[PDB]
Design a protein around this ligand. Sequence first.
Ligand SMILES: CCOC(=O)c1ccc(OCCCC2CCN(c3ccc(C)nn3)CC2)cc1
Ligand SMILES: CCOC(=O)c1ccc(OCCCC2CCN(c3ccc(C)nn3)CC2)cc1
Ligand SMILES: *C(=O)CCCCCCCCCCCCC
Ligand SMILES: *C(=O)CCCCCCCCCCCCC
Lengths: 117, 266, 266, 135, 4, 4, 279, 279, 62, 62
Amino acid sequence: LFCGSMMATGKILVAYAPPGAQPPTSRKEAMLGTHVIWDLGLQSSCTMVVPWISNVTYRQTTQDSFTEGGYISMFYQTRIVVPLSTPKSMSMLGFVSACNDFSVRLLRDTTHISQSA
Amino acid sequence: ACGYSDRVLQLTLGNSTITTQEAANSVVAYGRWPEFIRDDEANPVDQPTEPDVATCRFYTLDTVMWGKESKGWWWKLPDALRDMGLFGQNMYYHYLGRSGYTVHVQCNASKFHQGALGVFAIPEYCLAGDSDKQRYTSYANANPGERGGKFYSQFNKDNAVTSPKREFCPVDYLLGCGVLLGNAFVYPHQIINLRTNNSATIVLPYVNALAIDSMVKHNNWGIAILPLSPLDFAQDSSVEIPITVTIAPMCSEFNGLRNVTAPKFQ
Amino acid sequence: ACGYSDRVLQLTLGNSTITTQEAANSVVAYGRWPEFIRDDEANPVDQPTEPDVATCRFYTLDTVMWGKESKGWWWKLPDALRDMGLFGQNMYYHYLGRSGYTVHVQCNASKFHQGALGVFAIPEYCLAGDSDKQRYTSYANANPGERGGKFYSQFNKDNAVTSPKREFCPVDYLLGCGVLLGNAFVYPHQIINLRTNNSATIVLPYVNALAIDSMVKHNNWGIAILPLSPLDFAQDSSVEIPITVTIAPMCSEFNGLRNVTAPKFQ
Amino acid sequence: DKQRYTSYANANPGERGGKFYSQFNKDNAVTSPKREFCPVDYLLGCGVLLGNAFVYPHQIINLRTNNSATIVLPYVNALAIDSMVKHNNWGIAILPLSPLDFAQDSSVEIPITVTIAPMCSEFNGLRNVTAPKFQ
Amino acid sequence: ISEV
Amino acid sequence: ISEV
Amino acid sequence: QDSLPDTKASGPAHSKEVPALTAVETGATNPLAPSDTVQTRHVVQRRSRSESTIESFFARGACVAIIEVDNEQPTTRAQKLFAMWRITYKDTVQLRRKLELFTYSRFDMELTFVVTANFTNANNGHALNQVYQIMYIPPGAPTPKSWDDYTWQTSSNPSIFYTYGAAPARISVPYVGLANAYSHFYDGFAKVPLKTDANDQIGDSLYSAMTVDDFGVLAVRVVNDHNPTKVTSKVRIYMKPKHVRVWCPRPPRAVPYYGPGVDYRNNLDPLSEKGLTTY
Amino acid sequence: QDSLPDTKASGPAHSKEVPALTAVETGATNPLAPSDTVQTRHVVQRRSRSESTIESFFARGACVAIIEVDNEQPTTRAQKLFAMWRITYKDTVQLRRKLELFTYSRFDMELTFVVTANFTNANNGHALNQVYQIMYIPPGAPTPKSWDDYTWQTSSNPSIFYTYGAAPARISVPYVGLANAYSHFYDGFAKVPLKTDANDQIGDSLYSAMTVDDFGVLAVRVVNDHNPTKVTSKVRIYMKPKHVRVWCPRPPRAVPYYGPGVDYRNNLDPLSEKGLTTY
Amino acid sequence: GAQVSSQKVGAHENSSTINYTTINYYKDSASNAASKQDYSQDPSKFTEPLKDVLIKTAPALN
Amino acid sequence: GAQVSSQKVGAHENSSTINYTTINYYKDSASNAASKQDYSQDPSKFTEPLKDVLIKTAPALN
Ligand SMILES: CCOC(=O)c1ccc(OCCCC2CCN(c3ccc(C)nn3)CC2)cc1
Ligand SMILES: CCOC(=O)c1ccc(OCCCC2CCN(c3ccc(C)nn3)CC2)cc1
Ligand SMILES: *C(=O)CCCCCCCCCCCCC
Ligand SMILES: *C(=O)CCCCCCCCCCCCC
């Protein structure tokens, strides 16, 4: 979500690289993977789908190189352009959710809560 | 056909009409329109009071100002409307009351202004408090009425053990209740992003574990408004624009009539 | 119906998607969509390589900056894409290759910015050179790759007879090839006028005297971008905005496989 | 002494291939370990006996009988597709079941040439190129 | 029985 | 039952 | 069949339909599938959401309480010859957080009791096998004052008589709520302060608290008369919500619990440090 | 019927068909029967291969682990008040070799737990019967630091509560692999070293190893509070692969195992001495 | 009063549809085990609570 | 839901076809015992993996 002023324009590239190569440090490398060139305008928000591309049928929820998922990166395709009397710096908000093919298995306890003695 | 749009709406309830030329569609919480208690779900046996147009209409609360330092605002329902005309009278003359709501949040600015408000409708919005003392927030403090309450960037524990303030201390990134704000989006909501829209419109059903309840003892819905992205304009480091909240009770019905409830708010 | 528009487009090829909210429709060069070599037009008898999604996708070249002094930019195809991923590998491992292209030129600015870019797709864009010496531009110089070449406001003859630069000297009002720019409009084209649109989208068929050819020896299409009207903003006499060129090969097929071509580019 | 320690660069000889040994010489230099395979021939380089390797798909080039061997291989794995850079699916092992011999010349030498074709090759998950460090 |  |  | 939707084969696109662009301000999540923004093949999808059904998510016995009870000589100072526990899922954190992903719930409950015991001191002879009484005391019923007073007669209250060493005791309880659903959260009070009140203590209630006793207590005792030697016992209660239904989703608890209400006190900093452009 | 083929009556032969001669270079085993090279009578064959079916070959409970746990006073030095075991068939050799006659497998698993205990010292009084908790901790879940910390609340992890002296505990587990089959062998790595890496430790993996935790651990503790006197207990885990399917046959392990991989170290000499012409 | 249903067979022996039998022994439904055969539903009330729900290929704001 | 099959009778009493009955008590197929009635197959994929499989009375090499 682009939370800038309406007079502000811009083009952004958001991307996804499936695992196995050097994590993208430049737009040039990022371009070669799955990507969306977002154009700022009346439709405030842009969605990039990270397609299920995996060797294993199910990945682990824990960190693990054998079941790793790849890299997400964002770059300026052109740049943010504003007119005069307009704020030249602004916030971008981001959201994540699962597509209808998403599924999970083997119920476990979360590391995200605990109680002391 | 003709020229109809998502952005342009008219809402009319009772003798009140709202127009908006810059909306971002509208939300119906949980996919449920407000409805009356059906006979097969009824519990108090007494013939209900249904005040209709006199209570189911648009009451505008006092305006708040959004500035660069604003951490957030919150309201509870029915509490915010407790003094609003005949709705308030019906609420206090009856042991029981149920009501749905149309919530309309208003904030306009300019093509050169910037910022984004998250508007959330939370069922049972239990807030955290002041102290070491658990579940100690007083009734008068839990209930700000029309005035509403505010959010804070951090938790300052009410230290004076001798004469405790007994207030809520709602920290913004914890949604004032120990969870993270980013996940508040699972609640019925809209966003007022100034480049995109003037307002938010959320229709709320009556949500509770019971078909009807004491409106004076219990709030059903909480309206939380937070700056997801801070207000900004040109270079003026002290910008300020108004936010106005307007609410309408819907399908309001009351049971258990007797003398009026006069709560001590001091 | 619903709300569809000339201005809002989505282009998807392989694992790449482009969105544009401010387009001026799109051009299909000569009314012809890219297609594969049909059996009744075929010439090399060997089963072709058709890499499909791995090569027919959106490769973004290095961005150029448009400023008040910019005279123009030019690119050649396939040359600009010679190092682009698997397309480049296929191009150099095969004696023969044919491919069509979707060309997407990007340049956004603001309601208060001004200027107009002419974007032209030229079949066989033969350019003029440096010298007294006719047809002398060297291969390495005729082929800038992704980098592209530039235009000039006037012809400066490469004077050093002893060690000739062997470069092109493309004068802008002569379209770098001895004709007048105003007539370049007979070529497939679009205009990016900043008050009207962010981008240009031109779909190109394979155009040549042959059904297929050496991609390393011969460029089929030339992309020439010139400031028809100069960049301008408010009063800031040194404005600069980016122009980004993104290109996708379409219906790519290759013949004559063997060891890789390694051209000397020094 | 170190279990499961063979380095990636050593596990992967590329076109060059690897070799077998008549006996196990333990890499002794603890300070700077070679991290290589030590495949002993009669143990099929993996702790089993060579004579039972015949349960694997195979052919024999017996010089009096034939010039060559031709084995067609399916994709075999626990998954329909996988990382080719991380995991090898098939291993080709060539061993002298019976030693080379000619007339009386105690130093005979003849060439063995291996030619391989990929079949029904398909790829998924495109992005920038993998450049493995092979040094 | 109720076979479902 | 399922007698096999 | 409960398998998920098959992925559809999707090709190139040059059109006026733009699924990739949207407006989150509306309040809606953009319903996109991979085929909307990339070229996809056909996948016959066999995966299923069977283990994430509400029943499956809660279908497990969670430790909600450790009740300690002693069997020893009745002396004349504060002892543990019997113990009482207010029934709640809130003395423990793990199940509490799972249930609290939801505002309202409905379910039957399975209680399973694991009972362990041991000898306190080096030696005073031994102990014959113990039988434990777990009596449920509903709000209103007479509570025990002594380990063997008349209340333990249990003529109408439900009691379990557990024999040590036997398979862990188990019972099932119906949906017993006063409302049509259990409220995991109550933004309200049990009393309202009124202007006409004498002291202002009269109308004072705990915020978010409903009834005083809410569900009652479990009273535990060792029915055996004391040996010379003391035996300490612990009753571990495991509860499982079965035939579950839940309403209105809530954000998960992000910081440590501070008692029965939503209050927080410390470790309000759940998020690690990570550089914006660091994978 | 599953009986083998009957032997056919076969007589003398003087012909151009030569079944006795072949060429093993082709890669094939010569399909001969006794009737192809000798005169045979008719035998109505009743024997069957019923006990060598894959299911039958693996249908037996094999000891894969001995987990030792103590119940005693919590002192302040490294104790065994609880223990953890990485689930694998590889800490033992017997079942490992049987499964390793195959490259890939698929099966459900039956775990049966035999629990024995005894007194450590001459005498400090005695112990009341113990209850053991065996908690499965899937990769990712919080691991226990102490014998009675919150992790043992087991609200979502599966736990068994075993009572000493009861019939040996038993559970069944589904096919839980991330792939369509369990790989008994993996000629590969979990990471690739890349030219662009900072240290070369970053891309380093163990050869033949897949995931770090692979299947998780079983955490074992005695739920009982400690007696004065110490009790040592051992949990013996027996696993049985049921509803088995196997792919790609492999030669049996001929020399002793050296850890989780195919590595060998010593006793590389499996074959006895025997004279070429000695029966 | 026996109840018969089909198991969803994950790993299969080298041996089709397999069944299991259930009988309730108690009068109170609370005493019953869990069926675990449960119906799924639309995320819509959560993912798209709009008055005028719009189609994904069209502009969200019109 | 009772399942009935014939036992392969090895030693016979001085007393025909004998049966046994099976009932699955659990919803998860993993919980089930082993049927042990298993189908056998051709060694061919192992013993004769040839492109042109030849008949045993003919020359292996032709
Ligand atoms: C906010 C607190 O927790 C809950 O919301 C909550 C917690 C538990 C729950 O179960 C209902 C509690 C009352 C039950 C619990 C135990 N009961 C019995 C009955 C008999 C015996 C012998 N033992 N236990 C019968 C009544 C229902 C709701
Ligand atoms: C290479 C290692 O060994 C294996 O390949 C291998 C070994 C074992 C095997 O079983 C799966 C292992 C995970 C199972 C094992 C034990 N499980 C449980 C679950 C609950 C309880 C109480 N106790 N045990 C559930 C998960 C599957 C594969
Ligand atoms: C329906 O259930 C009729 C068929 C009954 C078959 C025999 C059931 C045996 C178990 C009966 C349990 C009775 C519990 C009081
Ligand atoms: C099919 O099984 C119908 C016939 C059932 C005969 C009685 C079965 C008695 C055992 C029932 C076990 C129920 C397990 C929950």
